[PDB]
Amino acid sequence: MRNKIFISHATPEDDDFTRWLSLKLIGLGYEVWCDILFLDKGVDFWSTIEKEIRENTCKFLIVSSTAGNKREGVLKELAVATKVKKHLQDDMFIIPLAIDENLSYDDINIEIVRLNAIDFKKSWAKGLQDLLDAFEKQNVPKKPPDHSKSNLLYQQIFLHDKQAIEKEETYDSNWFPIISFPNELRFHRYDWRLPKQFDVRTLAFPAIRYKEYLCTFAWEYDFIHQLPKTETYNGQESIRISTSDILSGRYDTDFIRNYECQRLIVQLINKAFELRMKDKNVREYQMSKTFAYWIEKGKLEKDKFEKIKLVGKQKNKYWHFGISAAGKLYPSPVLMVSSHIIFTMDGINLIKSKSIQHSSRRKQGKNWWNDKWREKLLAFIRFLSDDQNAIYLNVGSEEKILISNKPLKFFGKMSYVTPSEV
Amino acid sequence: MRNKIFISHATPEDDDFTRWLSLKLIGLGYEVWCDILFLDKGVDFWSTIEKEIRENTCKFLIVSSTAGNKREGVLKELAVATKVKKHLQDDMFIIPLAIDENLSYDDINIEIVRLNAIDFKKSWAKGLQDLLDAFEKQNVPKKPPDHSKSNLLYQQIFLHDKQAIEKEETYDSNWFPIISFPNELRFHRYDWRLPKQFDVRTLAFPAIRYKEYLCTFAWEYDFIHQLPKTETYNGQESIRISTSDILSGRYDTDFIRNYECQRLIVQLINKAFELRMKDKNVREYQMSKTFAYWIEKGKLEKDKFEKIKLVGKQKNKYWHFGISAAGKLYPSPVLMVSSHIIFTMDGINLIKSKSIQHSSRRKQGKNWWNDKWREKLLAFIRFLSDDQNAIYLNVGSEEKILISNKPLKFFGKMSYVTPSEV
Amino acid sequence: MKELIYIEEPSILFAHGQKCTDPRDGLALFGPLNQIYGIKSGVVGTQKGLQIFKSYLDKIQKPIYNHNNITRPMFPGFEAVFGCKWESQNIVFKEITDEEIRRYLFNASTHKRTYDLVTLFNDKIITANKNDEERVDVWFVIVPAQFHDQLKARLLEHTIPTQILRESTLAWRDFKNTFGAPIRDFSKIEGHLAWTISTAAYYKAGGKPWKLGDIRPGVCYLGLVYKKIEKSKNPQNACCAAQMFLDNGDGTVFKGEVGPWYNPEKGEYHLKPKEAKALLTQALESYKEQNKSYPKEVFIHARTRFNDEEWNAFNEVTPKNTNLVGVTITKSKPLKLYKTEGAFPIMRGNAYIVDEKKAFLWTLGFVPKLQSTLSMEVPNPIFIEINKGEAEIQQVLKDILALTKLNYNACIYADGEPVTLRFANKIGEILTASTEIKTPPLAFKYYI
Amino acid sequence: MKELIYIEEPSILFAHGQKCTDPRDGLALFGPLNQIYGIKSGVVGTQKGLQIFKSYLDKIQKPIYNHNNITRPMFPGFEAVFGCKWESQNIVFKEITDEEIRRYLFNASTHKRTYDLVTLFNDKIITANKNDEERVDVWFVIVPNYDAQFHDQLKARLLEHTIPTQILRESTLAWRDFKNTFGAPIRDFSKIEGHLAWTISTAAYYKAGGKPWKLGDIRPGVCYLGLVYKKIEKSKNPQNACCAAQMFLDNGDGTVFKGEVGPWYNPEKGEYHLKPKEAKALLTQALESYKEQNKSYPKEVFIHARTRFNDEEWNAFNEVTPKNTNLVGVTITKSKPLKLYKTEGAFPIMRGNAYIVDEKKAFLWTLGFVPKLQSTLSMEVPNPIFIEINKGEAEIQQVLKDILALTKLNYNACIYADGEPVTLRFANKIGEILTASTEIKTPPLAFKYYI
RNA sequence: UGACGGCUCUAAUCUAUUAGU
DNA sequence: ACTAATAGATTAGAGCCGTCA
RNA sequence: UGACGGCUCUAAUCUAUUAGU
DNA sequence: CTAATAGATTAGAGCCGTCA
Ligand SMILES: [Mg+2]
Ligand SMILES: [Mg+2]
């Protein structure tokens, strides 16, 4: 027999009110037939009149929006509806649901004013309840409510372009590995040599002061030009410790433990990197934390390095992509690399106030995304390299550390449908 | 066969009154057709309205208000009502009702008031009763009430039976007026006639002590037998004060004030009433306040006086009447009595426990009403009299007071109809 | 042979500006004044108490009948008269200790037993209010002697309404005696019990059943009553409480001035000057701030005469011209009147005037429409006297007659005495039956 | 090459025992859990505030549009989603008039300015609650020009009376007309308005005393806890210690989410740990809550923190463990640079992926790209959070799944997910309110008051 | 404490005299 | 001097009963 | 104080070591 | 006992944008 409560709606026209109404109607009992619900086939009004209107429909719920006059589909549906209304001679067959406001009786379709219907303009919960009681008073058949069916249907229909898939993908990290180290770390004794007032950071090579163990990665005679009175000392009293043993954590003596030694090495590599950035034709900017390194304008070929942008202009100022680094040692010897944006008033002189710096950083970085960040970081790291495969951090006369320019690569299993676009 | 009643109203403004009327009518029993309760959704309203006013209508009461004066729908509905009135040949079809009664008379409809109408300004239940009696007089076909009505029909009207009729009636009070008094109050003095230890309350006649003087009511030699060594004293030094001069309050003196004299007179009359009441062949019972006086069993013919029972027998015990009296003189010199019931076991010796006395009092007095109390009080006050006119009260050798045996009467011009007995 | 006088009965207001006389009939005919819809409830007690409460609450929803419905009208059901939801599915409940180790303290020190018993319920309610996530309106404490006073006294600070019910009251059908005799027989009253319980529950939930409709603007009514405190050794004797009746620009104001002003001496009841000054100042300030103007007239109700020097102190605070007419009400004067013929007593509303000041008023009689008598025996009148001030006696008589119908604690046709004195006498013991509290609440639902 | 482990997204409960993920769609489809039906409300403010509140209140009934319904769903109406009544004809209003004399700030010592400003509203509310006959559920105070600690002091001084309160500014409600007064536009909610209505309605309904939704993937006999220290240095003495906690328990039938609070203090400037004696009371009270509620001692207890535990203060915790309960402690850190970049495209890594460096430490991605919403939660490429099992023995992946599931309970908002677990968030939410004034003993431990 | 009324029983002050240093 | 006492006239507490012919 | 997140900028303390005891 | 280098580990406190 007929049990489906057909309700008409403007599927192509932008409408989002029929979906939840139909969902709660089917979850509240009787079945509902909709065009937007059964969106799995493409055909004109052929099966509708063939099956439901003629034989498989009890009531109709023709809605009445503002743009119903222009749409010919609703007019054809209303014509078929009045034909069947004449066929069964039942007046209560067409209830013109009204939602919008601009429908004026003076300017309205000449045929829709035949009847009056429940009003959904005020609040459609009251319309829901009055529709339910009107349906009850006319002995409309309805099955006992099984809302799990509605939940399952909602899960099924709204699934395209969602959820996860099994596609494979790869990611590149923000770290950079360390592939070499000097063979041994040295501690020298100078005592009577070194003046007890002058600063040690000014040396051409990184070296820091301990109680007696003057820490170095180079020989015991490499500071002669910087400073005199060093040839009256013997190298037999110096101390050397293997790098593999200290790195493995096995080395330990009474005076020094392992963690202090690892911290010493981290400080050494940090200072070495900071010193090495002196002769790479770049400038530096000072922050609350460690320095940032930015590139000058014009020094690079038409502001690009292998078809990529690093220095640009924003309305009046100029923006540069600067980086900062910090050595880490726990999981593997690597370098944290962080990206910042530096602003200048013409390209040679930096804007002074920090507040406008922050505002300009926000304004410029508003509309950047994953690809741009990754590309710029990779390009800057590659350009900073002095070799086609790695980077040499110069620690001594002939000793150096090697850092590769290929970040760690990860990959997983789960993924999604990438071209979401919007 | 025409049963339902069409109610015309200004729907956009007034709806609450129509709902009230419809609910009251359906609760009464008569079948009613209305606009917002039965049929408005998904149908051509004009065809239904016309067929209802043409086929199955008996009365056509309408709602009149300043908002509905210029509404096209109701006025054309009333025009159809006039057209069908000119076809039915019955003039009892339209009964207008009014809700608003604060408008000038020169704005009314062209003709809506030519019939008999009712007003609802005063209330809504009274107008409902007016409409109900109009319906009853016009013989509208009755409806089955399922043998559960006549309960709301008791209270369908605002006033069930309450109204102040103008009948006359009388009431008998509980006060008795003193119609006479002896001439003067006396103050005797010797300071040696009596010992300073014995109690004056044992004297045969009332008297009290005030300063060195003895305030009293009779002659000075009247206490010779009880108190010897008194007749040898002079009687000239005694002081006399007129009773009328103090009762009016005009009298005043440094050594005695008027209110003190009134208190003394009250004390004297109370004591004299006790003294006389001692010798009237009755017994006394002691309470927290002054005593009460009751009648022994078997001292009258068949335990009654003037065919009115005064002593009765309960299931096991016996109950007797009793009164207690006190004199006051602010509004007028009067004596007021109060009625109590005293319980005994046979009629000679009475019960002792107070709790059983209270319980028996409550149980016996549960079912005594105004007439019984009035008749018993009047009979008891009549029997106690020494004369057919009043009651004497001797104070001394020859002086005496008179108390009328008829309570003061109060007549009223406003009362009720009847308790309907039943 | 003198003349009595008649005073027309006043009327009370209802919904849609309707007026009636019987509160039950008016409520059943129109309904309450304002619209509220939430009776979320919480009950503390044993499981048997909870199940009895649930059974009674689901019983209430159906109409009930009375043997003589012409006198006491029937109850149609909660959903019809009030138009609000109060069901047995949204009730919160926390069990009391089952074994009740406090039972043997019944024969022990009474004060310690009472303190522990009240402390248990107080702590349970306080914890529930302060910790639980649900929201509750009123607490229906169920119990299976200076106990009702202390429970409300200690809850004053937290400002949480409550209402006490007994198991035997709700379950009188089965809670008979052990000798085959019904302790309570509610067959003739069964409908009225539901009526009064429903009215009290609705009022304590924040609604208003009815209000007066024949008040005059610019007139403030004030009452006063003294309470006796002698549990402590010091003779205090002075606990002055008061209410206030005000006509707001639209509605009415019904609250009570508070703060138990004291006074030494044993039997010296009247007052002290400074306390009177403070009382009058606070009362005047309340109306002044509420209505932006000083009251035109002020009436001082009392049940005892007051002296002149304290009255002079009162006069010293009169703003411009307000007359502080003081009225004394007494209840024990024997002037019983008997009907000449028949078996029905004198109706209410009559009055007897003996001079310019004194009068007798008959607020107890029989109602013609109800066809029954309020008092069991022949009624007695109340004595009214004008002590200090100048006014018109008949106006005072009719005003005090109109003031005896607003008793939210019950649903009776009329009350014997004005409610202004009654509510102060209701709050005095609650104030005086515990430790001193500073600035207590001014709402009646807490005290009632 | 090192892989990434994936964790399935949990689900939340709704009415009629149904399951969904996004709270907005579930609420619009199913409904709240318990049935409350009274929103009797009262306001305090000037006439303009009252009229603006009335306008917004009757506006909220109609359906509201959103520009991208795929990302931010619809709001059909208050009566539809919640099934309650919230109108403008059942309100009580108390004028503030134009006293306004405090506006000259006293030209100095703004502390007493804040004191007086908060005192006016506090006394108004207290008098209204104590004397007025009508019943009110929540109060909406409307404030028009510059202040610092109004919010903390207002809720601090009202804690004793236990009255819920919500604070609103008419600029937010009436952003349509509060546009550029001289050429400086301030707000524009055209793209968002539905979201604003959603959030305000959810907050009001929760404050009224209703439970919108609850989690449904908890394990019986398992407890939870939070911890955070607050800095109080306005007084000269170095205090540095304000330890609160929250509790999320599975009752015999439902759930329980409350706070265990009492300010525990500590000397010394930078000692962020806890004294050995004080920890005993905190653990004892936390244990006793469950013991009294569930008639038995808990089986497992998890402690969450943002700092590590020393040896002695943790050993003090062991003397209170009843028989064998394991007090596994977890440390969460929110600053470690490991930005992972997708190889190709323009969309970042989607949430739910975790990285394990060892049996103790882990990186968790609570922020990413939600395919169902077709949008990202973070503006730029997201950064993960570091999770470390400090003391005790447990399984890392289970802890990861539990903390991931714990991020979906934020009753102050209506967002799909939260960056950090709520148990940490609410302790910090109540810490400043408690430390605004230190004149309270035994404060309420519910949530309507502090939020 | 469901709530109203009708009684029954206790005590205490405020006046005005006279009995005890 | 306040301790008793015998009156009039106020003013407050408590403890039991019936249910509106 | 309708919510959320991304930056930027300021402080403590704890742990080797040196010098001003 | 107080001061300078440096690492790793904590808290506050403002200001801009709304997921292409
Ligand atoms: Mg009560
Ligand atoms: Mg909030």
Residue numbering of the annotated binding site of C for Mg(2+): 409, 448
Say if residue B275 is exposed, middle or buried (CB neighbours under 10 Å; 0-12, 13-18, 19+). Answer: middle
Task: With an 8 Å CB cutoff and a minimum of 3 pairs, decide whether chains B and D touch.
Answer: no
State the DSSP code for B45: H
- As given in the structure block, the two tokens for residue B382 are 């009549």
Look at residues D253, D281, D254, D278 and name the one whose alpha carbon lies nearest to residue D267: D278
Look at residues B187, B203, B190, B205 and name the one whose alpha carbon lies nearest to residue B242: B187
Residues 136-195 of B with CB under 7 A from strand E: none
Look at residues C304, C305, C300, C302 and name the one whose alpha carbon lies nearest to residue C318: C300
CB C32 within 8 A of CB C202: yes
- As given in the structure block, the two tokens for residue D202 are 């959810």
Distance CA D211, CA D218 (A): 18
Domains of chain C (ranges; CATH) run 35-204 (3.40.50.2300), 219-447 (3.30.420.10)
Both A332 and A277 in one domain: the answer is yes
Q: How far is CA C150 from CA C119, C146, C429, in A?
A: 10, 7, 10
Domain-embedded: residue B419:
no
- As given in the structure block, the two tokens for residue B234 are 């002079």
Domain-embedded: residue B337:
no
Cited resolution, angstroms = 3.4
CB C208 within 8 A of CB D134: no
State the DSSP code for B415: B
The distance (Å) linking the CA of A263 with the C1' of H4 is 19
C-D Cβ pairs (cutoff 8 Å, strict): 62
Query: What residues contact A419, with CB distance under 8 A and at least 6 apart?
Result: none
The amino acid present at C341, given as its one-letter code, is E
CB C342 within 8 A of CB B415: no
Helices (H) and strands (E) in chain C, counts: 12, 20
Nucleotide nearest to A199 (CA to C1'): H5
Residues 329-388 of C with CB under 7 A from strand F: 330, 343-344, 366, 370-376
Q: How far is CA A350 from CA A286, A287, A291, A302, A342, in A?
A: 11, 13, 15, 21, 8
Which residue is nearest to the C1' sugar atom of H11, using CA?
D231
Which residue is nearest to the C1' sugar atom of H7, using CA?
A263
Of the residues A140, A157, A174, the one at which a domain ends? A157
Domain-embedded: residue A417:
no
Query: Helix C47-60 and helix C190-204: axis angle, to 10°?
Result: 100
CB D243 within 8 A of CB D229: yes
Alpha helices (H) in D158-245, listed in sequence order:
170-173, 193-208
Counting the structural domains of chain A, the total is: 2
- CA atoms in the 13 A half-sphere facing the CB of D439: 8
* Other residues' Cβ atoms within 10 Å of the Cβ of residue A304: 12
D189 CB neighbours strand G below 7 A:
yes
Question: C284-323 as b/e, with b when 16 or more CB fall inside 10 Å?
Answer: bebbeeebeebbebbbbbbbeebeeebbebbeebeeeebe
The distance (Å) linking the CA of D263 with the C1' of H11 is 18
Q: What kind of experiment solved this structure?
A: cryo-EM
3-class DSSP state for residue A292? strand
Distance CA C195, CA B185 (A): 63
Chain A residues whose beta carbon lies within 8 Å of the beta carbon of residue B40: 116
Say if residue C350 is exposed, middle or buried (CB neighbours under 10 Å; 0-12, 13-18, 19+). Answer: buried
Shortest distance between the Cα of C202 and any Cα of chain B, in A, equals 23
- Residue D412 known to bind ligand: yes
Nucleotide nearest to D148 (CA to C1'): G1
Helix (H) or strand (E) holding B372: helix B370-383
Distance CA A223, CA A211 (A): 20
The distance (Å) linking the CA of A357 with the C1' of H15 is 12
Query: What residues contact D11, with CB distance under 8 A and at least 6 apart?
Result: D19, D20, D21, D216, D217
Distance CA C120, CA C143 (A): 12
Both A145 and A208 in one domain: the answer is no
Both A188 and A148 in one domain: the answer is no
Query: Helix B72-88 and helix B45-55: axis angle, to 10°?
Result: 30
Distance CA D99, CA D94 (A): 14
Say if residue A68 is exposed, middle or buried (CB neighbours under 10 Å; 0-12, 13-18, 19+). Answer: buried
Nucleotide nearest to C331 (CA to C1'): F11
* Other residues' Cβ atoms within 10 Å of the Cβ of residue B35: 17
Distance CA D382, CA D347 (A): 11
Domain-embedded: residue B369:
no
- For residue A409, which phi and psi values (nearest 5 degrees)? -115, 125
Both A145 and A201 in one domain: the answer is no
Domain-embedded: residue B281:
no
Look at residues C226, C303, C312 and name the one whose alpha carbon lies nearest to residue C268: C226
CB B192 within 8 A of CB B257: no
Are A94 and B45 in contact (CB < 8 Å)? no
Q: Which domain range does residue B29 map to?
A: 16-155
Q: Which chains touch B (3 or more CB pairs under 8 A)?
A: A, C
Question: D294-331 as b/e, with b when 16 or more CB fall inside 10 Å?
Answer: beebbeebbbbbbeebeeeebebbeebeeeebebbbbb
3-class DSSP state for residue A312? strand
Are A416 and D369 in contact (CB < 8 Å)? yes
**Which residue has 């001594």 as its token pair?**
A396
Nucleotide nearest to A257 (CA to C1'): G16
Beta strand B292-294 with B311-313 is unpaired
Look at residues D24, A380, C377 and name the one whose alpha carbon lies nearest to residue B338: C377
CB D76 within 8 A of CB D28: yes
Q: Tell me the DSSP string of C303-372.
A: SS---SHHHHHHHTT--SS--EEEEEEE-------EESSSS--PPTTEEEE-SSS-EEE---SEETTTTE
Domain-embedded: residue A210:
yes
Domain-embedded: residue A126:
yes
Distance CA D84, CA D90 (A): 14
Distance CA B276, CA B279 (A): 6
- As given in the structure block, the two tokens for residue D127 are 């008098």
The distance (Å) linking the CA of C165 with the C1' of E2 is 9
Look at residues D434, D391, D384, D393 and name the one whose alpha carbon lies nearest to residue D304: D391
The amino acid present at C414, given as its one-letter code, is A
Of the residues A157, A172, A195, the one at which a domain ends? A157
- As given in the structure block, the two tokens for residue D321 are 């463990």
Task: For chain A, give the residues followed by a break (C–N over 2.5 Å).
Answer: none
Both A134 and A219 in one domain: the answer is no
Distance CA B124, CA B20 (A): 9
Distance CA D260, CA D249 (A): 12
Which residue is nearest to the C1' sugar atom of F10, using CA?
C304
Q: Tell me the DSSP string of D132-162.
A: -SS--SEEEEE-----SSHHHHHHHHTTTTT
Q: Does residue D310 belong to the interface with chain A, where contact is any CB pair within 8 Å?
A: no
Q: How far is CA B288 from CA B285, B354, D23, in A?
A: 10, 12, 79
- As given in the structure block, the two tokens for residue C182 are 């019904």
- As given in the structure block, the two tokens for residue D387 are 């999770």
Are B45 and A116 in contact (CB < 8 Å)? yes
Query: What residues contact D285, with CB distance under 8 A and at least 6 apart?
Result: D260, D262
CB B412 within 8 A of CB B176: no
Beta strand B169-172 with B409-412 is antiparallel
- As given in the structure block, the two tokens for residue B370 are 């105004």
Domain-embedded: residue A12:
no
Both A146 and A188 in one domain: the answer is no
- As given in the structure block, the two tokens for residue A379 are 């390009």
Both A215 and A100 in one domain: the answer is no
Shortest distance between the Cα of D35 and any Cα of chain C, in A, equals 8
Both A394 and A252 in one domain: the answer is yes
State the DSSP code for D388: E
